[PDB]
Design an enzyme around this catalytic site. Sequence first.
Site, short mmCIF file in Angstrom:
data_model
loop_
_atom_site.label_atom_id
_atom_site.label_comp_id
_atom_site.label_asym_id
_atom_site.label_seq_id
_atom_site.Cartn_x
_atom_site.Cartn_y
_atom_site.Cartn_z
N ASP A 175 4.57 -22.48 39.18
CA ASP A 175 4.81 -23.07 40.44
C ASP A 175 4.91 -24.81 40.43
OD1 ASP A 175 5.30 -24.01 42.96
OD2 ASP A 175 3.98 -22.51 43.89
N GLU A 219 -7.90 -25.80 44.43
CA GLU A 219 -6.96 -25.20 45.03
C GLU A 219 -7.28 -24.03 45.68
OE1 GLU A 219 -3.21 -22.61 43.60
OE2 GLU A 219 -4.57 -22.65 45.58
N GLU A 250 -7.71 -15.14 51.75
CA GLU A 250 -8.85 -15.20 50.65
C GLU A 250 -9.89 -15.78 50.82
OE1 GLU A 250 -7.23 -16.24 46.80
OE2 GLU A 250 -5.12 -16.16 47.40
N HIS A 289 4.93 -20.04 45.74
CA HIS A 289 4.65 -18.76 45.65
C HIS A 289 3.75 -18.44 46.89
CE1 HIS A 289 0.83 -21.10 44.22
NE2 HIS A 289 0.29 -20.21 44.60
#
Lengths: 343, 343, 343, 343
Positions: D31, D123, D132, D280
């Site tokens: 990406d 990240e 998440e 993504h």
Amino acid sequence: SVFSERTEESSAVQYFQFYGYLSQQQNMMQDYVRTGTYQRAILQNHTDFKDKIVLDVGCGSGILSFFAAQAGARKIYAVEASTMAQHAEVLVKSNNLTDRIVVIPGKVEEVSLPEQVDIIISEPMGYMLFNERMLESYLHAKKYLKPSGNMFPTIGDVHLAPFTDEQLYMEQFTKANFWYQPSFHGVDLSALRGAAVDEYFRQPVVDTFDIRILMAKSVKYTVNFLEAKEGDLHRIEIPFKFHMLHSGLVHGLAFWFDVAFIGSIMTVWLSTAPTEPLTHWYQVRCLFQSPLFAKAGDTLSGTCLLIANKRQSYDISIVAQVDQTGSKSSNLLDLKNPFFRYT
Amino acid sequence: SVFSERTEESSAVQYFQFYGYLSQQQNMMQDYVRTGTYQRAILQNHTDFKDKIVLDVGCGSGILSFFAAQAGARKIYAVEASTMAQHAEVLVKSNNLTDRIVVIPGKVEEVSLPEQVDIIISEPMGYMLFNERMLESYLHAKKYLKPSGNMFPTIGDVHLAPFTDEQLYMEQFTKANFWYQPSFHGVDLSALRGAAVDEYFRQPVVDTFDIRILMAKSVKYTVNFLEAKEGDLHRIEIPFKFHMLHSGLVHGLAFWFDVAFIGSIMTVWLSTAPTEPLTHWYQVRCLFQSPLFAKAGDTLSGTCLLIANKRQSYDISIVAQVDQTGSKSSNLLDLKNPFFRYT
Amino acid sequence: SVFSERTEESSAVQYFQFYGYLSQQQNMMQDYVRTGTYQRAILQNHTDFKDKIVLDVGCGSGILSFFAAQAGARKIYAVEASTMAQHAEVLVKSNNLTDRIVVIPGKVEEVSLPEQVDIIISEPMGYMLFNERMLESYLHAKKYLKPSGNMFPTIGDVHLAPFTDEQLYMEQFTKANFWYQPSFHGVDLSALRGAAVDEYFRQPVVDTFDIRILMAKSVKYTVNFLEAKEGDLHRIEIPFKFHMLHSGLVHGLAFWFDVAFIGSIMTVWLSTAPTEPLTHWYQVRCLFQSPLFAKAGDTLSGTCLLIANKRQSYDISIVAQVDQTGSKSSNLLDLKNPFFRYT
Amino acid sequence: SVFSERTEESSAVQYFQFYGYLSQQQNMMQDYVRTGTYQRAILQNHTDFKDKIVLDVGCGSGILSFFAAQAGARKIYAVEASTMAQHAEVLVKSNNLTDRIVVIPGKVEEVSLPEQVDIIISEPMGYMLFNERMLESYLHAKKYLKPSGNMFPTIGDVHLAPFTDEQLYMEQFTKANFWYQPSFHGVDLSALRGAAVDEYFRQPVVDTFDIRILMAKSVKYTVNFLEAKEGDLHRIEIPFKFHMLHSGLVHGLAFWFDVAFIGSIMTVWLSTAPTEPLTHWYQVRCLFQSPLFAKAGDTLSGTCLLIANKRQSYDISIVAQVDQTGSKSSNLLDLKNPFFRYT
Ligand SMILES: Nc1ncnc2c1ncn2[C@@H]1O[C@H](CN(CCCn2cc(C[C@H](N)C(=O)O)nn2)CC[C@H](N)C(=O)O)[C@@H](O)[C@H]1O
Ligand SMILES: Nc1ncnc2c1ncn2[C@@H]1O[C@H](CN(CCCn2cc(C[C@H](N)C(=O)O)nn2)CC[C@H](N)C(=O)O)[C@@H](O)[C@H]1O
Ligand SMILES: Nc1ncnc2c1ncn2[C@@H]1O[C@H](CN(CCCn2cc(C[C@H](N)C(=O)O)nn2)CC[C@H](N)C(=O)O)[C@@H](O)[C@H]1O
Ligand SMILES: Nc1ncnc2c1ncn2[C@@H]1O[C@H](CN(CCCn2cc(C[C@H](N)C(=O)O)nn2)CC[C@H](N)C(=O)O)[C@@H](O)[C@H]1O
């Protein structure tokens, strides 16, 4: 001699044996772009030849010497080191030009000419311009050129540009992957896979291609044959900075060249660019072992360094980098032994 | 050394540089007929190798030495003169066979072997068997062979047969007639047409063909590698008397070869005949300068004389005559520079 | 229980959660080949169900139990471990079949049934037949089967055959070659390429293909569900010997399976072969990291070893060899995480 | 630990197994927007890294640590809980940076670091930013941050906007209506149609869309990572008041996010907006159970309440009303199980 000092005897024997074949002369002569453009350059500048003394470096069959004669040259010294010199003499006689074209067998670095000349003509260009190192013989011959003398061709431009071609890349990588096999007839070859990739990617690819594979405007490197000395061509450093016009994988650099015949009447160009009709020089591409990804607007910078070797060719070092990401690629190519892919 | 005495340095350099490329080894390794038959020959005759000492003359990648290892050899001395010796060494280590395979860099005529061997293995065959003159190196290696030692291959058969191929013959003139024009860009080239024709006919033609072009049963010339001396291959005289099976024009002689591995368990053949699957050796055809007419039942008799030269090849002299008519033809060919015609 | 002892809870949670979704049931129900063949198998053998006691192992939505009811079954015990059991019950009521279909929530290895059954029905087949390890639950359920009782499906055939598909191979190899980059944003990734190759090729490829890529007749491995015990599926060793029909590169082995419903009236087959209409099982291919070359007439021998793991899948070991050459290949595949390539 | 207390083990197992794959690391690395912007942010703010101590939370392959190294960091702690830690270590070694980069296997909430750091890089963003729940690990790591320390990224913006997409809305019923048939292979499925519809509407839709479906400027909710506490992300209440730019039916809310790297030299933005090149992360859309009609100039007000759950995700509660009309709609969604719709 200067030639023997810079040339492996093994290379020279093979080299001059190659040009001793009539079939090879035919192949060059039948490149109509080449032969026709040379004739146009000479005849359209007939005043640069009329009643002049001419030197033809590596006359081969003698065709360029004949053009010079058609243009009115008073005397043409046609130097050729291969056995083709014998056939050139045959043609000079059968064409009733014994009074103007004088074949002098031998290397231009070794023969003796009776007088200085007004203009030197030659076709010293190899693949990617510099292959064969015949340009050095061309410049060397300037020792016979008068101060007011000219050179045909007068200048040479080398063009390089980044290209994308997945099929070519995979084609070469597939060949090297033979050495990836863990059990070829029960034998593990994989240990040599690195050496194989290295060997295949060392080969410049000689063929033509669609201009749409090019991803940036070409960078130009000019050699002025009137100004340059032999020694200038021992180490050729070509820096580049491409402004990427398209996004994608850069698989290497594409090369081609133009020469200009700068005469008194007009300048005539002979181009091997992919935008022009194909010549026997085709074009040359040097692949990266791993492609570099770049986006439109990015800059691709680096250096193409050519180091002359004693096999009458160059060791080519290409280093390229995507400035914005620091992605860097390197390769060493052996210009002597390219892969001829054209079909 | 014996090698240097029979070989011009220039030829040797080019020769071993060629085999220094992994891609060239690869091309040979991928000839399945060649590689597979050698493997079958060695493995199916395992008693000729089990716990034996082996010499591999010109091991290249080392592939035949590994086959000898697969067959149970105790020690294999693998001799190689090109830089490929370095890669062979890499493979012996990566295949955990350093205790059995010993790579010895250098020419087999110059290196020293520590002991005598039970069997010599090699692939010394070139175009029409004899090209490259490596058979002499193979025979030379017999100085290291025990009195009861064997040779793999054991014998070589060269076959010659007359052929008719009107298109191949005419093709030579079509190409040479390029020079038969009075004004190629203003130049009359016709004077060189003769020389061009001669040049084309001096090239043996490498490619394959339909067996129906053959006009008589082949004549065979056998080299027994167990008995032959190096010197036997300097001058090879092959007399022939063909009994014509078909009527027509004979345009030349076609060549191919077989080798046999005569082992204790069985004899295995490797054939490059036009009736067999193609190999990288293809077949070779030598044209007559003038075709000979013969009707079925006639006899075509003459001689094929192969004279070794220092360019690791042969000068080929062929003379033939139709006995019933006295019609005679000859040609002189240079096997070093064949014309690769296969498409 | 037998299930929990062989299954990591984390896998079980995810597994039964997956089948708890109505969208997933819909997807399976819309596989018309699957659903139609099952109804076909049950109804055309209605005599095997009429007035019989039935067990449906993993009834999901209950569709197979309804078929059993349509065929005249007297009582059907429908066992389902996911929350789908609730929805199946809803359907039983809305279809007025409460007197005939009895949903029993729980794992078949854990629940209690009031009586022994005449016939067990189920759809325990996963990718490459064995994935999900549900076959063991199906076999486990025979503890509830009367002597001489039947099973639908009755037998399962696993087929394997060698295939050539260079495009698939390079597709996977290209992905792994991302880790070949020596300067990804200035970072050398090459040290991880081996690990990348190992990871990507560990993935079986789920999709379909043209039968022409197959290079030999398939080998068949049969599991008889009437005879087999669950423990038989812990280690499945499938030897194979292929007689190569075509020459070329073998890039791996293709897998598919058939099940047969051997009833009293007729035998009905459900096939996922590439010669048959596509099902949601598609076919499965296991790639070699490096292809094996074989000629027609050669034999490809080896073993496919499947080891059940606690993640309801199998570790796949494939070892294959071209007998004539000794060319050998091995791979380790993880059936749990396949690559879905179709469309 | 803090991590284990907020995470059900099965989810954690699956989570870190997922990131243990080189193919998943690769997908993120490829990406270019994501990777290039992180590199730009770090290198263009080199003064924030030169001779600094750095912490990389969830280093994965280690790519961000290498960027920090490129910027001159004196020492980098790279923490990674998945088995990817082993591969990062390999790259650290192969890139000769062992003296500067220290890979620490384990969860950042559980490992021990020897000293405080000047800046944390990471990240941790998931779908609609918060998925998440890795942001909590990022904030948790500030226990190792000096008081004057910085965070890269420094802030995160989640954007919400109302959208109209009649096809997307109708699509849910088309799929669910599979169950609305009285005899699917003889079975009445109608009773499950309601449950099917509900199931589809609980799934947020991950894909991209034309910006023209948006009917008002987004509402922004900002998290300042320098100021925020881990606990702030357990319950995220996002009130909204949209000023409708267009008239029409609102079918739900669209989500995307931006992060800013606020350095000493400049602020660099990474955006996943639908007006920007696709990443993504794509975008996320949550449907209302019933559309709301709104006129241009009307206000759509309500609340998006994000509630963290033990599956490393969020339960999404949306309530909206057209103030001028009092028309009200709601939905409850499960972000753990999104529907990947992108084509
Ligand atoms: N030091 C020297 N002294 C005297 N003679 C010398 C010499 N070095 C070279 N020569 C001779 O120069 C000739 C050069 N050759 C043109 C060659 C240019 N060229 C390159 C390629 C492609 C590629 N590089 C290749 O190797 O084929 N095609 N043409 C023929 C050009 C000639 N004008 C002609 O029309 O026939 C050859 O006959 C060669 O023997
Ligand atoms: N005196 C010497 N001392 C030591 N090493 C020597 C030597 N003379 C030759 N060699 C070496 O022998 C090798 C012969 N080569 C097989 C080449 C035979 N061949 C002929 C042709 C036909 C045609 N002439 C052509 O050029 O292709 N193609 N291959 C590889 C054989 C190898 N064992 C194999 O089976 O893979 C070459 O690597 C060469 O360098
Ligand atoms: N030990 C156990 N006790 C009780 N119930 C159990 C069980 N093990 C599994 N189940 C349950 O069995 C059902 C199996 N499923 C069919 C599954 C076969 N399958 C494989 C694939 C492809 C691939 N392998 C995959 O889906 O991952 N697609 N369908 C549905 C079959 C059922 N007849 C139907 O038509 O709906 C599932 O609902 C599962 O929860
Ligand atoms: N408590 C903890 N302790 C230590 N390590 C931890 C941790 N929690 C998570 N990690 C680890 O953090 C890593 C985050 N990952 C970035 C992944 C984030 N992400 C979300 C999405 C969108 C969507 N949710 C999806 O996954 O599809 N894509 N990437 C890689 C980032 C990497 N530095 C890079 O930028 O190249 C993962 O490798 C994970 O194992």
